[PDB]
């Protein structure tokens, strides 16, 4: 049956949710604690989730996601409610996940990991990234910030949705810094792969506690990037389905790869060797999250047994073009269809 909700104004914004959430705290998000599981969760006011025919879509996109994701290592749904009790009242969507205490950002703070943090860490993030791409979902966007770590160095990924505009990936942005090349510069239709090239950037920042690619803008970032990995070859190059991208990366200078060793000094040799492999420039010839794992990096954390992949994602409704009012009655049977964990 339905529960009762109450009224309570925060961000200037009137939330309406169920009695069970207490102590709502605004951190738009709000802190609160859940009276029935007992937990801390994060509690997300959707902002105008049906105004247009993009952000209802994205509105379903985030809802279908978030609904489907269940891996200790992915930010998964404990709850989602809306006041409305019909689907012509229907227009708030709150979503509801555990309240993560920090970021990658906030461990990292300018300083170097112990390798044995670092094995821990990048573990977590390809055990979360195995399950993801096992549905065919692609991240686009893994950065320190949309990675969640509690006291006991557990870690969720977060966000996936909404993507960036051009001004803020836009200059000496961490927007920017963690993009596989071929995204950066749509240089091709790319895959699953470019986060692969993000967890690479990841780990060689918290190897050395250091921006591996701090590019001050897109171009700038290209020459840091191929001055480690080198040029492309001509294989590469046939893969650039964009005749101007093409083009100009003709125009560089060739490089040869650096030696991984002499760039990450002093850092254990299996993650060097890691690092080669994610860190190609090539996205078919990167080593892939399932194959990561099983790297002799991890051998003290990898298990056959307990990496698992995800049931099938429906993802036909991205192809699909809709009106207003069906991606919201869409998005309504999602929310009323909902079943909580146990
Ligand atoms: C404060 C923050 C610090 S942090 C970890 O971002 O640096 N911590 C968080 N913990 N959980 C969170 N969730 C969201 O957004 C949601 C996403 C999906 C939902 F179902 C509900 C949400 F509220 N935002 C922040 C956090």
Redesign the pocket.
Known sequence: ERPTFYRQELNKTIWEVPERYQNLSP?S?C?AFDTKTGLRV???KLSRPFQSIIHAKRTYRELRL?KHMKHENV?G?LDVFTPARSLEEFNDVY?????????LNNIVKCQKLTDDHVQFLIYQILRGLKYIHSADIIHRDLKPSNL?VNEDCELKI?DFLARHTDDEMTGYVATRWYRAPEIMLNWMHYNQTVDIWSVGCIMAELLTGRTLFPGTDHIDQLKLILRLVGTPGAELLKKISSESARNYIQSLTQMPKMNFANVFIGANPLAVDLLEKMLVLDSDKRITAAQALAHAYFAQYHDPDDEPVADPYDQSFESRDLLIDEWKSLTYDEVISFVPPP
């Not at 979503?95 to 970021?103: C, N, R, Y």
């Open positions: 951190v998000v802190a994060a509690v997300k978030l930010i749904l979503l509801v996940t555990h309240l993560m205490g920090a970021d969640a977060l």
